[PDB]
Every structure is written in structure tokens, then in C-alpha cells.
Scaffold this active site. Structure first.
Site, PDB file in Angstrom:
ATOM      1  N   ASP A   1       0.850  -1.181   0.000  1.00  0.00           N
ATOM      2  CA  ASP A   1       0.000   0.000   0.000  1.00  0.00           C
ATOM      3  C   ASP A   1       0.889   1.235   0.000  1.00  0.00           C
ATOM      4  O   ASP A   1       0.583   2.234  -0.654  1.00  0.00           O
ATOM      5  CB  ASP A   1      -0.895   0.012   1.241  1.00  0.00           C
ATOM      6  CG  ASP A   1      -1.853  -1.165   1.289  1.00  0.00           C
ATOM      7  OD1 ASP A   1      -2.206  -1.697   0.210  1.00  0.00           O
ATOM      8  OD2 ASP A   1      -2.251  -1.556   2.410  1.00  0.00           O
TER       9      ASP A   1
ATOM     10  N   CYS B   1       4.359  -4.666 -17.331  1.00  0.00           N
ATOM     11  CA  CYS B   1       3.846  -4.162 -16.075  1.00  0.00           C
ATOM     12  C   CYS B   1       2.835  -3.081 -16.430  1.00  0.00           C
ATOM     13  O   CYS B   1       1.858  -3.356 -17.130  1.00  0.00           O
ATOM     14  CB  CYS B   1       4.990  -3.627 -15.211  1.00  0.00           C
ATOM     15  SG  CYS B   1       6.220  -2.650 -16.084  1.00  0.00           S
TER      16      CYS B   1
ATOM     17  N   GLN C   1      14.050   0.919 -14.220  1.00  0.00           N
ATOM     18  CA  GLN C   1      13.872   2.367 -14.274  1.00  0.00           C
ATOM     19  C   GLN C   1      14.389   3.119 -13.054  1.00  0.00           C
ATOM     20  O   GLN C   1      14.520   4.340 -13.089  1.00  0.00           O
ATOM     21  CB  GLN C   1      12.392   2.693 -14.472  1.00  0.00           C
ATOM     22  CG  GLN C   1      12.134   4.058 -15.057  1.00  0.00           C
ATOM     23  CD  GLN C   1      10.653   4.329 -15.265  1.00  0.00           C
ATOM     24  OE1 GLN C   1      10.258   5.458 -15.562  1.00  0.00           O
ATOM     25  NE2 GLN C   1       9.828   3.296 -15.105  1.00  0.00           N
TER      26      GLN C   1
END
Ligand SMILES: CS(=O)(=O)NC(=O)c1sccc1SCc1ccc(Cl)c(Cl)c1
Length: 284
Positions: A189, A221, A265
Site C-alpha cells: 500500500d 507491467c 527504471q
């Protein structure tokens, strides 16, 4: 940049980590720079017809490695935001692509058919932290039809950290294939992942499901560069360990970075790769 012998690699992880991860930082800076004196064209990605086909404006598909759709009876029906990427000691072992939009579900399953893909690796939740990452491209139950591809859900197994869906697909054009989707579902979360073992098992099991003499593995993704790249490097490097007992994370990432922009990334992802390989080595 010769490979590092496997027996010294965890030692080398120690050094990269030291002094507030100075070493990891130098390495990833090198990665991000290794495009410097390198212009790579992506003219198709930038074409007005194709723009609605990209999820994020600045995440493009390099022309040279882009996956081509067989064209339909229009000059741009051949485009999808996706590139071939190499695995260990193999070319185009992967297709790395964005999570498919509503407007590109047809293209997505077509590519799957044309390229004879038999394994999907999904590394996102449809929604995460309240933000839409991916539109659902498969049927919640039974069958759904996308263009000339009918997708039928046959089987599901939901594990703690990932789910496995076995689809059957057919081209309306009688000819049918099994396509299995490995979906990593466990997402914080707050923040980002922090134990690599569950990912390592996900990778081992998904990589092992590949069938000999099939097409490339599809890996997506959301944007199709960050976690996509992390999967690819970890997978390739377990292969290399198994075969030669050496590791070359830095060399290999520099390489596939020419094949699709921004693979792996962030530095945190770059570190996660090492953590996964560390688990795999200590585990043996
Ligand atoms: C760009 S971010 O979303 O802010 N951060 C991350 O995603 C970050 S930051 C450290 C790991 C990750 S994702 C790790 C991961 C999870 C599942 C799999 Cl199957 C694989 Cl291959 C790799």
C-alpha cells in the site's frame, strides 16, 4: 566488464551496498548514461496515428527492436508499444510491452498469436495505490473475444504472492493454443517491495513454464520498462549462473537498454535485482 564469478558476487553486493549504496549509485548512473552518445529512433511510436496506442507519452518503442503486427487490410495497423529483448545467450527471448489499453486489446492478443507467445508475465496490479495501472485484457470468467482471438479462462490458482491463470485461445481466422499468465499480485500500500525471495520463486516458476520451440515470453507491467526490466535481468542472470556460474548484471542491462528505453527504471529496482540473485545463491 568481464563477468563476476558467482562465488564472489555476494561479496560484491556487500561493496555496492556499503557507504549508503554509493556503489549501486555509480552503477545505475552508468546505466542511465550509457545512452549518452546514442541516438535511437522511435519514429513510429511518435506518429499521430499511433499516439493513442501509447499508455505514457514518453515511454516509447524503439524502431529497430519493435514488435511488428502483420498489417491489416491502414499504414499503421502494424504498430504496438512493444520490443523484443534478449535473454541469456539467446536473442528475442522476451517481448517487453506496456500493459494494454482498451483501444489496444486486439493488437495485444494478435501479437500474442502472430508471435506464438505461450507465456505471459504480468507484474502489476490493475490498480495500485488508487491509480489505474492496467485495463483487464482477459475474461473474469469463461470466454471473451478480442478481434479474431477468443480467449477462454480454463483454470486459476491463487497463491500468496502471485496468481496463475491458464487460458485457451483460438483464432477464428479452429486452431487453438494454451497460454499461461503468471501474475504477481502482491503490492505494498505504501512504498515498494523489500523481500526478494517471493519474486525469486515467481521468476523461477514462470521461467520454468516456458515451452521449447515456442515464441518469446511476453512481460508487461504498467509502462513496461521498470518491473519488466527487473524480471528480465533476474531471469537472464539465473540462466547465466546455471550455465557458466558467473554474473554480469551491469553489462547485460547496458545491452538490453538499447533494445527498449528505461528497462530497470530506478536504482531501487537495480538493487532489488541483486537481492534476488543473492537469495538464489545463498539458497544453494
Ligand atoms: C517503479 S516503482 O513501482 O516505484 N518501484 C518498484 O517497482 C520496485 S523498487 C524495488 C523492487 C521494485 S518492484 C520488485 C519486483 C516485484 C515483483 C516482480 Cl515479479 C519483480 Cl521481477 C520485481
Amino acid at each position: 566488464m568481464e563477468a563476476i564469478p558467482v562465488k564472489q558476487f555476494v561479496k560484491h553486493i556487500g561493496e555496492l551496498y556499503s557507504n549508503n549504496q554509493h556503489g549501486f549509485s555509480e552503477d545505475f548512473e552508468e546505466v542511465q548514461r550509457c545512452t549518452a552518445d546514442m541516438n535511437i529512433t522511435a519514429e513510429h511510436s511518435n506518429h499521430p496515428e499511433n499516439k493513442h496506442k501509447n499508455r505514457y507519452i514518453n515511454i516509447l518503442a524503439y524502431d529497430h527492436s519493435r514488435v511488428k503486427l502483420r498489417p491489416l487490410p491502414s499504414k499503421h495497423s502494424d504498430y504496438i508499444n512493444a520490443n523484443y529483448v534478449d535473454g541469456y545467450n539467446k536473442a528475442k527471448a522476451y517481448i517487453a510491452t506496456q500493459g494494454p489499453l482498451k483501444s489496444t486489446f486486439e493488437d495485444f492478443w494478435r501479437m500474442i498469436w502472430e508471435q506464438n507467445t505461450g507465456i505471459i508475465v504480468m507484474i502489476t496490479n490493475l490498480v495500485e495505490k488508487g491509480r489505474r495501472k492496467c485495463d483487464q485484457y482477459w475474461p473474469t470468467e469463461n470466454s471473451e473475444e478480442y478481434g479474431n482471438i477468443i480467449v477462454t479462462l480454463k483454470s486459476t490458482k491463487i497463491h500468496a504472492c502471485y496468481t496463475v491463470r491458464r487460458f485457451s485461445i483460438r483464432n477464428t481466422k479452429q486452431n487453438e493454443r494454451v497460454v499461461i499468465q503468471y501474475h504477481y499480485t502482491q503490492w505494498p500500500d505504501m512504498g515498494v517491495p523489500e523481500y526478494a525471495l517471493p519474486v525469486l520463486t515467481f521468476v523461477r516458476r514462470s521461467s520454468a513454464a516456458r515451452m521449447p520451440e515456442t515464441g518469446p515470453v511476453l512481460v508487461h507491467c504498467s509502462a513496461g520498462v521498470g518491473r519488466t526490466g527487473t524480471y528480465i535481468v533476474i531471469d537472464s542472470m539465473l540462466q547465466q549462473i546455471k550455465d557458466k556460474s558467473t554474473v554480469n548484471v551491469l553489462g547485460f542491462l547496458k545491452h538490453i537498454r538499447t533494445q527498449r528505453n528505461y528497462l530497470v527504471q530506478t536504482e531501487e529496482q537495480y538493487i532489488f535485482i541483486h537481492d534476488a540473485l543473492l537469495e538464489a545463491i545463498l539458497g544453494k
